[PDB]
Amino acid sequence: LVHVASVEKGRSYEDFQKVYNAIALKLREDDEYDNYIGYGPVLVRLAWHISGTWDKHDNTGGSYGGTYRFKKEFNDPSNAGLQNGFKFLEPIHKEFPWISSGDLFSLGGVTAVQEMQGPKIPWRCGRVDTPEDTTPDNGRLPDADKDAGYVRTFFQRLNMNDREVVALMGAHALGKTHLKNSGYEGGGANNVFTNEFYLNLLNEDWKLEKNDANNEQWDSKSGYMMLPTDYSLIQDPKYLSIVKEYANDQDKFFKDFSKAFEKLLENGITFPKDAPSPFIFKTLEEQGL
Numbered sequence: 001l002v003h004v005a006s007v008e009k010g011r012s013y014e015d016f017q018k019v020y021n022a023i024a025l026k027l028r029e030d031d032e033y034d035n036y037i038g039y040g041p042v043l044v045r046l047a048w049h050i051s052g053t054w055d056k057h058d059n060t061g062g063s064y065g066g067t068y069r070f071k072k073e074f075n076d077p078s079n080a081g082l083q084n085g086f087k088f089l090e091p092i093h094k095e096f097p098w099i100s101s102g103d104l105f106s107l108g109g110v111t112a113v114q115e116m117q118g119p120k121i122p123w124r125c126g127r128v129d130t131p132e133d134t135t136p137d138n139g140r141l142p143d144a145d146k147d148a149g150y151v152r153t154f155f156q157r158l159n160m161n162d163r164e165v166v167a168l169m170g171a172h173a174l175g176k177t178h179l180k181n182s183g184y185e186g187g188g189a190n191n192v193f194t195n196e197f198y199l200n201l202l203n204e205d206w207k208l209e210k211n212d213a214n215n216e217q218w219d220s221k222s223g224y225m226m227l228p229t230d231y232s233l234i235q236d237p238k239y240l241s242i243v244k245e246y247a248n249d250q251d252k253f254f255k256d257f258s259k260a261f262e263k264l265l266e267n268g269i270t271f272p273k274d275a276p277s278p279f280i281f282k283t284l285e286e287q288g289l
């Protein structure tokens with residue numbers, strides 16, 4: 001099972017930069033979503049969830065096939081809330097129908113991170129929509145009510161190491177949890193990509209308690225929250241070291257996140273040797289737009 005990258009016929013970097021810019025402009029415009037968080041964080045979560053179904057043991061799942069567009073995956077309970085990102089991207093797809101679904105979903109995440117002032121994330125085209133029977137079954141995305149051992153083991157399936165895991169979890173600087181989606185509770189929210197996840201972990205005073213849905217989470221006096229899997233990153237001694245590093249080095253966190261996130265979005269894809277180099281898209285700000 002090989003998924004070969006195939007460039008959308010006749011398309012080049014400028015075509016994709018146009019897609020990037022349409023997403024970026026809509027992000028800027030549709031500013032009231034989720035109490036003024038905007039759609040950035042849900043697009044990041046979407047890109048992660050379309051990718052996180054991958055299994056290195058058989059090369060099934062991952063971003064390549066655009067299979068989130070199919071009912072079984074769209075309705076995965078782990079994907080609750082992500083319908084909002086799909087709806088956001090729908091008109092973008094209508095504007096640029098030549099882009100594959102996996103390319104759009106993954107590009108949405110890249111665009112969101114960069115527009116939220118995160119690192120540049122190189123991105124490659126050529127994901128190809130595959131048929132409904134290639135849709136992975138539900139249950140491949142991780143549970144939040146678990147400990148460090150679970151996190152470490154889970155991410156081995158995505159070929160992620162301890163540093164990659166801690167870097168990718170820093171995306172939890174973004175957005176918030178919603179009781180109706182996940183059974184987790186928290187009013188704190190943010191739409192600027194920073195290393196604040198690590199700084200909160202280390203600096204807040206956390207108390208484990210049951211929330212209003214009877215699920216355990218870690219809550220601070222300030223009103224912030226951590227999932228059990230978030231908090232595991234300071235419970236485990238190896239994870240803790242890396243949390244400290246990223247709390248103390250914004251640039252290292254940005255570089256490590258960029259590499260891990262591109263890897264996440266590329267897992268399962270075979271790029272021919274004559275494939276284009278990864279594209280680094282300019283932000284709207286860099287374009288004077």
Ligand code: HEM
Pocket residue numbers: 041042044045048080081142143144145151168169171172174175176177178179181182183184227229261
């Ligand atoms: C152990 C791994 C992870 C677990 C258990 C987990 C769990 C969760 C949960 C329960 C939520 C709240 C969903 C909602 O209630 O709306 C959430 C939100 C989010 N997650 Fe994760 N996550 C994990 C890893 C990641 C990764 C690797 C990324 C991306 C690199 C990511 C990005 C996000 C973002 C940006 C949000 C906020 C979305 C919003 O505000 O709508 N997560 N995650």
Ligand SMILES: CCN(CC)c1nc(N)c2ccccc2n1
Pocket residue numbers: 172173174175176177188189190196197200224225226227230
């Ligand atoms: C770093 C604190 N925030 C954002 C204010 C936060 N913390 C989290 N632990 C978190 C977990 C899942 C989704 C969003 C999240 N956001």
